[PDB]
Amino acid sequence: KVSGNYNYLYRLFRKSNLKPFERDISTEIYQAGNKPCNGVAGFNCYFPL
Amino acid sequence: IRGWIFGTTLDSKTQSLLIVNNATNVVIKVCEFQFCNDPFLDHKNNKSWMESEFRVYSSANNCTFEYVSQPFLMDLEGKQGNFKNLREFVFKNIDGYFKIYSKHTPIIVREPEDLPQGFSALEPLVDLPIGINITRFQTLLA
């Protein structure tokens, strides 16, 4: 749509190569940094999808 | 003994399994179930079995799989002594498909638990498109 359809999503961050033929609903913080990042965003704190 | 669970978090963080049976039905579910630390169907009084406290999960979230079907061989109530039932199951997941094999044998008469030197083939029960990850399991017994 010219106004844009915002009902589609896609993952970006995952430290494990998933096996064939399965789903994954987990939306958890990607701890590529070395801090206990719960946070909201920022340095070493990024949204997964 | 009634069923098993299969999952990776078991605390409503991620989806998991639930295998249950009841007299003349069997229910298989895959859902975001909050498994309480005391899932049971036995402690109801001193020495008798009732079916209360069945819903040991308080998160009836979007269950991604529900299945109702026919159960296996059983007996009514419970009597101690003269045990003869030998039930055998094996469970395995592969390529996102869950597989079960089952077999029962009568007249296991010996009182000491020797598990006699017997042999028997195991036949497939049914495939299931589980499509989820599993890391641990715990038995649900009445």
Swiss-Prot record, chain A:
Changing residue 1 to T: In strain: Omicron/BQ.1.1. Disulfide bonds join 37-45. Changing residue 9 to R: Increased resistance to neutralizing antibodies. Decreases HLA binding to NF9 epitope. Increased binding affinity to human ACE2. Changing residue 40 to A: Increased resistance to neutralizing antibodies. Changing residue 13 to L: In strain: Omicron/EG.5.1. Attaches the virion to the cell membrane by interacting with host receptor, initiating the infection. The major receptor is host ACE2. When S2/S2' has been cleaved, binding to the receptor triggers direct fusion at the cell membrane. When S2/S2' has not been cleaved, binding to the receptor results in internalization of the virus by endocytosis using host TFRC and GRM2 and leading to fusion of the virion membrane with the host endosomal membrane. Alternatively, may use NRP1/NRP2 and integrin as entry receptors. This is Spike protein S1. It comes from Severe acute respiratory syndrome coronavirus 2 (2019-nCoV). The lineage of its organism: Viruses, Riboviria, Orthornavirae, Pisuviricota, Pisoniviricetes. The gene is S. The chain holds residues 444 to 492 of 1273 of the full protein.
